[PDB]
Symmetry: D2
Subunit: 23 residues, 4 copies
């Protein structure tokens, strides 16, 4: 369960990084 939650958190961070890159 913690591994899956971390994976979700990494997916979310990835989205944030893509928004940062585009801005």
């Amino acid at each position: 369960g913690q591994l899956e939650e971390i994976a979700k958190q990494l997916q979310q961070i990835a989205w944030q990084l893509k928004k940062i890159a585009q801005g």
Copy 2:
């Protein structure tokens, strides 16, 4: 470009973590 590549790398790690969790 580095931000987007890191995002890809995080997405890949997330997949790896989900496989690790399931195993």
Copy 3:
């Protein structure tokens, strides 16, 4: 500021993954 915060989060996740691996 966002990047520095993300970096902090990734470092904490790494710490947690190591603890998970240690048992």
Copy 4:
């Protein structure tokens, strides 16, 4: 072993994000 390696990668990514933020 995989988890420890992922942790290492996330730590390097964090280092790089901080450098990107520093200019």
